[PDB]
From a paper:
GLIC is a bacterial homologue of the pentameric ligand-gated ion channels (pLGICs) that mediate the fast chemical neurotransmission of nerve signalling in eukaryotes. Here, experimental evidence for carboxylate binding to GLIC is provided by solving its X-ray structures with a series of monocarboxylate and dicarboxylate derivatives, and two carboxylate-binding sites are described: (i) the ‘intersubunit’ site that partially overlaps the canonical pLGIC orthosteric site and (ii) the ‘intrasubunit’ vestibular site, which is only occupied by a subset of the described derivatives.
Indeed, all of the monocarboxylic and dicarboxylic acids were found to bind in this pocket with a similar binding mode for the first carboxylic group involving Arg77 and Glu181 from one subunit and Arg105 from the neighbouring sububnit. For malonate, the molecule is too short to reach the Asn152 side chain and the second carboxylate is thus coordinated by Arg105.
Numbering used by the authors:
A (entry chain C), B (entry chain D), C (entry chain E), D (entry chain B), E (entry chain A): 5 to 315
The structure:
């Protein structure tokens, strides 16, 4: 078996389509997802053409070994996809209709800047390397691009699965390469983060602020230090679920800013005590009374600035 | 080998049956389970018919390669099932009786709303794609559907394994697909959650309420803050064992509600101290005495409302 | 190749034997173990018989493909065993002596009721499905059942590896099945649990009881609450190493009971303080003096009751 | 299929090239990385020579099994590479152009001395063992060495992918061996470590130093001990992400040095209290006032010395 | 293909050699290591002898299928080794020279008694089972035993790779089995354990001893209890990195002994307070002054006894 010879000097168009059956294991740390889907390939092989009246049959079925099939690969996969040929059908004019069911672990970078209120565009890149006989160009058959209704990616909302119809045709190692970008638009289900991380973290911070209504240094030290320890636990929990980004994430920014609030609260609690011992509680009382409004106001305004910078 | 030709224009019925040998690894976070079972297929191939008199035999055994076998796939599997053909038997009328032993990792969504007092319906979807020659239909042979008595899924009670007899008949990528739903009804063994999570969590909360019988702010701050830290540990332990759900879970609702009780206790403890310093323990004593009944009553009533909303 | 035809209508006895070479990875959470062993099969195929005089040879060696070999499977394996045929030898009378070396991950339930002072019986189930031509029955060749002296399962003592000689012959999906039960009796090496979990847990509890020799509520609250936090850490450590059981485990019972002791200690510490503030330390002193004997005595007697109920 | 014969007594040159498609999973603990690339091999096998007029084609395509292909292995891989032959093209003179796409987990030691401000040189070693008939020598075809622009290794900056053109030709087990060094220079994206580990760790340390502005031993003990516990959490978090090195790492050195600062702070806090009880707060006040400048100055100077020693 | 027939009744000698290429993943918990090496086999098969004059060749290359190759297995491997035949050469006298490159996960028990100051001997056991026509005995070809200079096992120093020249011949299931032991002597790089575990653990213990210079029960309770919690964290960290041993380990012994020191310190701190309240600080002062010397002296002497018992 060899590639079909050209009529003129035209390239061989291989019409593609991916129909998603399953989407699972979107690992944020690894920036990988798992996909189980149908891959459909269609090209014309004039050698395979037949007379439908003389042959009786309207379609002829071939085994992969029996005919020429273009070597389609996925660019962004960990290892080569596991594939099982579903069907190969040849029409009287010689149009080959290949279909396979594959499973692969796809490497697709994520943007965590707005986490956990972020949306992503997952990619699946199809590629074909040209041959010495003739160049192979990829196309999108929109009728064969889709996803089944039941496709669920845990903790994500699937927005759309579409292909960028114009292929990226470039030279690689003195041969032509035809690349196709299949995009899966998803958005994170941020709900869980509110009762699991966001609200517990705000509560422990507000509990620390009750020290602004207490003159007891020993009890204030306990309050602020203990709540800071609880905050560290949440910070660690959050960073163990995320990859190391060279940029600041929304959650990471909030978490870091809260450390400064704990630090300033310690300074206040210390200032309040130093003045009390120094026989001047009049100055301590004014600082503490100010902190009661200052701390929540500055926190609320700081978060407004942060949200603005990130969204 | 090609599919058996129709006598008239009837579809080709492939009678199915799944006999569960093993059920293991029900991952809640991944919403996947592992299954090891027998798959039995039965269809009529008139080309394989023989006269038992001149043949000498009543049944003829074939190798998978020797005859046409329908391409049955599982919809909701991670990767294609690992299968080993056990037996292929042909009766004189050409009724083929295929049997294989398979192992597969099944993707089946779970409903955590009532966790850990929840029941699930695990699905195993069988599918066959029709060919150009004819429409391949799936059926259920109820005599060949079951599970062995010893089938145990750790931390779960297996209620029933039944098949939805009527198949789904739809078109996918210009060919008819015939899907069957094999349902495995299970219910969670909630027992362990009571001494491991529920009761320890209630005890640490009740220990915090002993601050309503103490005038010592330093000791109260220690009590409430330290028990809140213990509660955070339990919250983290629970959420590390569950997937991120876009809905509130029963356990999650209880856990979140308890954070508010700790927060209100801090407010009370602070109010009690502010009044004591302000030379008015008469107001502090009345608030503290009220909290002694208020906190358990509100907790008990809140849980009644929660349980009602969830069950 | 087809099964050997019967002389009369008797079944084909396949004499089995498992010789354990390795035992590893006994996962308590997963209730699975890994085994690397020799599987020996022996049956008579009269068609393979030869004259040892004219043949010159006393034994004839065959390749698996050359002759009929019975399809022996393992019931409780995760996936089908990885096997490599070591040897196939035929005696002049046609007695086949097959030997293979295999590796498999075995699913075998564990009883954690007496953990970590528990013993288990691991099972390896051999099975053969009968054929249309003749019935196949399994037997045990005790000369070919054993384990090598070096077989070590980390954290376990291997007591015995024996087979239940009488097979379980039952009907499954209109065909006969012959099941064999290979039992591996083991017992847990409980030593490590004493300095790693048991003793540290008792020490933190005894440290809490020093509050019965202190009138300082602030220091008592610190003592009891902090040691309760340490106990939670040990509880979590223990439950992360065990599966969720629908029954109470010995360690789990002890751990839960200790929570009540901490809870009652808090009540005592609170009662002692309430009476001190109420200007009556005479009542507080009598309660505290009683607790000094009551707490250890009740703890020692409670553990006697627990140990009795469990052993 | 033996190696091609020599014209004179020269070795057979196999021109190599590695084109990186994907770089992922750089495990610091395991000192391994995963690579997905194109491997191109080119050698002359005169036996494959053809007349393109007689043959009809200008280039002949062969299946790997059909012709002699040099046994190229990777030295530093865990297991043999998962390879898929992309193309084998033979030109009329017998020049073979082999291309394959592979994936492999490469073992390459890392130097953690300057972590997280460290750069690495990852290695990919190609090897060929000489045969009976003639010696096989490796070469680099620079036209076939590179990496695609999109190649991203999470948490790392890829500097260059180059090959050491002169092979390492040495004798091993009485036969010649030809080794090629492909180097991938990378540098760590240190950014994340600043808000995640470095700054939180400095803040908890500075919070501890507020005890130098307090005379309360009970509050100072709380401050220093609690912040030391938070530091332990960060130390553990850091060491769980790193392998055990026989040398001191930059981060490890900083972390260790901070333990001494906490230890000396405890000594100070104890000294301050012992003098207060001993009725001499004049000595305590002078020590505490000194510590206020001493602790930050010594910390800042110590870090200057550390950074100097490491960079 | 059959084994070479014996001239007299002499057993066949298969000369072995292992040349280590890679050593990685020494899992302490699993007591397994991963190896990538060359296996060389050499035996006389007189049937393969040829005249180098007539044939014109001085060596002959065979494919594994073409000739008899002895079934060499590894005793202590998880699953059968992944091997790729590198070369098979026959000399004119019929001396076969087989070479393969393998990779395997080796199960080799470790002795943790002196951890982390322990040395191990890793084993690689080669085995051959005799056949009905000839007894096979294994030998060591010292010229073909080695390791490459670059072989690195992370956190370990590789001392030597040698073979026990005299095999361990024994009968197994009525057939001779010839076993060979390849010893890889390694010693642990203990350095890291000093700044990561040993020193932090001693510092937290010494910080606890500052309570012997304080009369404040509330501050002493805080000091000793909080440092005990930090010690529990280190104990857990250590035991999560080690398997459950039926013997006491050096680190485990030290860690356990330190629990007693914390427990006795609590008793002292309680005794000191009970005497202070009982209006007799004269007795408390003498006990506390004694503890200042007693605690470090007993600790230092206890460690001398421990180190002596273990080394
Ligand atoms: C305190 C200083 C913290 C500096 C950390 C910034 C690193 C980072 O996270 O990102 C690096 C970026 C670089 O610009 P950019 O990535 O193209 O963002 C802009 C594009 N938007 C709109 C899609 C997000 O920094 C900045 O925007 C620097 C300017 C703001 C400083 C605010 C200080 C408060
Ligand atoms: C500390 C408190 C942190 C609170 C975070 C508020 C959410 C946020 O920061 O933003 C809100 C995001 C918006 O996402 P978007 O619509 O895709 O962006 C807009 C894209 N523009 C700029 C191109 C137009 O989602 C929500 O409406 C979720 C609201 C959750 C409220 C959580 C309360 C706790
Ligand atoms: C804090 C306190 C938490 C208490 C949780 C109680 C259990 C629960 O909340 O519910 C109990 C669930 C109910 O499940 P169901 O029968 O399917 O309800 C469907 C009902 N309809 C059809 C009318 C809507 O299970 C049980 O019967 C087990 C009882 C377990 C008691 C454990 C007590 C601790
Ligand atoms: C807190 C309570 C401390 C735990 C007490 C140990 C439980 C026990 O008493 O354990 C007992 C088991 C032995 O059980 P067995 O003989 O194998 O069971 C079969 C017994 N029948 C068939 C008669 C029922 O272990 C021991 O030898 C315990 C020695 C270690 C003591 C731990 C000290 C701390
Ligand atoms: C708290 C306890 C601190 C730990 C003390 C180290 C134990 C020890 O001294 O361990 C001893 C081992 C050497 O043992 P070996 O090489 O196997 O020789 C055995 C030879 N015999 C059988 C003749 C005796 O390492 C050392 O030289 C320790 C150096 C590191 C010291 C770290 C101190 C902190
Ligand atoms: C009170 C005393 C102090 C208590 C000490 C508390 C410290 C808690 C220690 C943190 C444990 C977090 O757990 C650790 O975090 C890292 C952070 O990137 C995560 O990341 C991990 O990813 C990979 C894959 O798992 C591993 O190769 C590596 O071990 C680790 O980097 C993991 O989830 C876990 O290995
Ligand atoms: Cl393809
Ligand atoms: Cl691919
Ligand atoms: Cl099938
Ligand atoms: Cl399938
Ligand atoms: Cl078999
Ligand atoms: Cl099996
Ligand atoms: Cl190759
Ligand atoms: Cl390789
Ligand atoms: Cl071999
Ligand atoms: Cl092996
Ligand atoms: Cl023998
Ligand atoms: Na083909
Ligand atoms: Na078939
Ligand atoms: Na479609
Ligand atoms: Na066979
Ligand atoms: Na070849
Ligand atoms: Na052979």
């Amino acid at each position: 078996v060899s590639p079909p010879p050209p009529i003129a000097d035209e390239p061989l168009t291989v019409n593609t389509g991916i129909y998603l059956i399953e989407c699972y294991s979107l690992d944020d740390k690894a920036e990988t997802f798992k996909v189980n889907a149908f891959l459909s390939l269609s090209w014309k092989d004039r050698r395979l053409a037949f007379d439908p009246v003389r042959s009786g049959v309207r379609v002829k079925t071939y085994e992969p070994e029996a005919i020429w099939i273009p070597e389609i690969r996925f660019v962004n996969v960990e290892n080569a996809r596991d594939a099982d040929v579903v069907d190969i059908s040849v029409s009287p004019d010689g149009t080959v209709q290949y279909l396979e069911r594959f499973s692969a672990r796809v490497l697709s970078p994520l943007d965590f800047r707005r986490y956990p209120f972020d949306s992503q565009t997952l990619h699946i890149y199809l590629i074909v390397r040209s041959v010495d006989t003739r160049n192979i160009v990829l196309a999108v058959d929109l009728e064969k691009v889709g996803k089944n209704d039941d496709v669920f990616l845990t903790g994500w909302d699937i927005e759309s699965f579409t292909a960028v119809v114009k292929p990226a045709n470039f030279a690689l190692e003195d041969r032509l390469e035809s690349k196709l970008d299949y995009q899966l638009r998803i958005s994170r289900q941020y709900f869980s983060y509110i009762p699991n991380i966001i609200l517990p973290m705000l509560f422990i911070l507000f509990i620390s602020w009750t020290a602004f209504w207490s003159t007891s240094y020993e009890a204030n030290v306990t309050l602020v230090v203990s709540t800071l320890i609880a905050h560290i636990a949440f910070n660690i929990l959050v960073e163990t679920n995320l990859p190391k980004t060279p940029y600041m994430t929304y959650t990471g920014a909030i978490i870091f800013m809260i450390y400064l609030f704990y630090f300033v609260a310690v300074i206040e609690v210390t200032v309040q005590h130093y003045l009390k011992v120094e026989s001047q509680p009049a100055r301590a009382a004014s600082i503490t009374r100010a902190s009661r409004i200052a701390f929540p106001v500055v926190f609320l305004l700081a978060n407004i600035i942060l949200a603005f910078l990130f969204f």
